[PDB]
Amino acid sequence: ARVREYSRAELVIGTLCRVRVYSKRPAAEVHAALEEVFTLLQQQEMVLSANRDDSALAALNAQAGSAPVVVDRSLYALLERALFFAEKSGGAFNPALGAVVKLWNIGFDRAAVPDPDALKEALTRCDFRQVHLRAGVSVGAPHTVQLAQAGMQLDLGAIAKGFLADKIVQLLTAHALDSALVDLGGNIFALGLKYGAQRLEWNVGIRDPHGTGQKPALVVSVRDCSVVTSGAYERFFERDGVRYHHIIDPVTGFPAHTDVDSVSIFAPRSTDADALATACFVLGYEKSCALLREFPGVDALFIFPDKRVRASAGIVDRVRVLDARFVLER
Numbered sequence: 001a002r003v004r005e006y007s008r009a010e011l012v013i014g015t016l017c018r019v020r021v022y023s024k025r026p027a028a029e030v031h032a033a034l035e036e037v038f039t040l041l042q043q044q045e046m047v048l049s050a051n052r053d054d055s056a057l058a059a060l061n062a063q064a065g066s067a068p069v070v071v072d073r074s075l076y077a078l079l080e081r082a083l084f085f086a087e088k089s090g091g092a093f094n095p096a097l098g099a100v101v102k103l104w105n106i107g108f109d110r111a112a113v114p115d116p117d118a119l120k121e122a123l124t125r126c127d128f129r130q131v132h133l134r135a136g137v138s139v140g141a142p143h144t145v146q147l148a149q150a151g152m153q154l155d156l157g158a159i160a161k162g163f164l165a166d167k168i169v170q171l172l173t174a175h176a177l178d179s180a181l182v183d184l185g186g187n188i189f190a191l192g193l194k195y196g197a198q199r200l201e202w203n204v205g206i207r208d209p210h211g212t213g214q215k216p217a218l219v220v221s222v223r224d225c226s227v228v229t230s231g232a233y234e235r236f237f238e239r240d241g242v243r244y245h246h247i248i249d250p251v252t253g254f255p256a257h258t259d260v261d262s263v264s265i266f267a268p269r270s271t272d273a274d275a276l277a278t279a280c281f282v283l284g285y286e287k288s289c290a291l292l293r294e295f296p297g298v299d300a301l302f303i304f305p306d307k308r309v310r311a312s313a314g315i316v317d318r319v320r321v322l323d324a325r326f327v328l329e330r
């Protein structure tokens, strides 16, 4: 049995999703697995999307301030984890920010900042402590979500790719695959080891925050790890000389003003890395380091505006600088 390398990529969940696999299984078995990967991504776009009218999440949002809504166990577990990170981060990650983000999302499409009062009114409808998850303990009891606060809107944009990465890994493993690189719009899971037969860690790139994005600034060797990066220049609009990026500080209702240009989180679960990367970007370096003390199994890499890079002890030895303008502090 020979090792063969496969890759498939599609536009789905609003971005480029690619999976690369090394396997000695019959090719028809890899092909079936990859068919299922991209079917899952299509199906889940219709569960999770905050910017289609026809998703499960949109239907849930169209019921805020009313009665509990039944959701599948998958979505329920995602919401549970999201509310967990909202609590732990002190609301720096907030999965009930849709009132605010939708005010800004229209701002992107036409390069205009929301509106003082409107933005203030929106911030009153983002209390994630008013999302009530309940699931009976009897056989086959349904999972339900209640949005108690009128006009509150869920938006799982900052955790859904992680969730989907984790679900893809689980599917790959179900297909007896154990070597893959999953890349959902830059949200990476490195499953197993790659082949060089010599087995080697995956070398995950971290971009220059201000790059044209073509090339990484740094590379980190990892196994069985998600790598998720949040940054200040990944998605933004400009108006009157001011850049407005997509990661909102829930306290201000404006794009977060922070002391880091990017934060990359390394975790066994991509769900966690995705939430935490967004939380840490909002929180800034010192407060991030205190939060991450809560999560001893996670590592982190910060790129500062002066191009210094600090990485936690679990990963610093695995970092290689490719763009010599950056400096890795040790």
Ligand SMILES: Cc1cc2nc3c(=O)[nH]c(=O)nc-3n(C[C@H](O)[C@H](O)[C@H](O)COP(=O)(O)OP(=O)(O)OC[C@H]3O[C@@H](n4cnc5c(N)ncnc54)[C@H](O)[C@@H]3O)c2cc1C
Residues within 6 Å of the ligand: 013, 014, 015, 044, 045, 048, 049, 050, 051, 092, 093, 094, 095, 097, 101, 155, 156, 157, 158, 159, 160, 161, 230, 234, 235, 246, 247, 248, 249, 250, 274, 277, 278, 282
């Ligand atoms: C299922 C699905 C379907 C999608 N469909 C589309 C599409 O059709 N078209 C398209 O252009 N993009 C789409 N996206 C991408 C989506 O709009 C993201 O909102 C955006 O690209 C940012 O993701 P990130 O992973 O780069 O950043 P992250 O930092 O992981 O997430 C930032 C996003 O989370 C939300 N948010 C902002 N601030 C906070 C915060 N403090 N706490 C929590 N959440 C916050 C906003 O939605 C913001 O865009 C989709 C994503 C998913 C999961």
Ligand SMILES: [Mg+2]
Residues within 6 Å of the ligand: 157, 158, 159, 230, 273, 274, 275, 276, 277, 278
């Ligand atoms: Mg995120």
Ligand SMILES: [Mg+2]
Residues within 6 Å of the ligand: 157, 158, 159, 161, 162, 187, 274
């Ligand atoms: Mg993300």
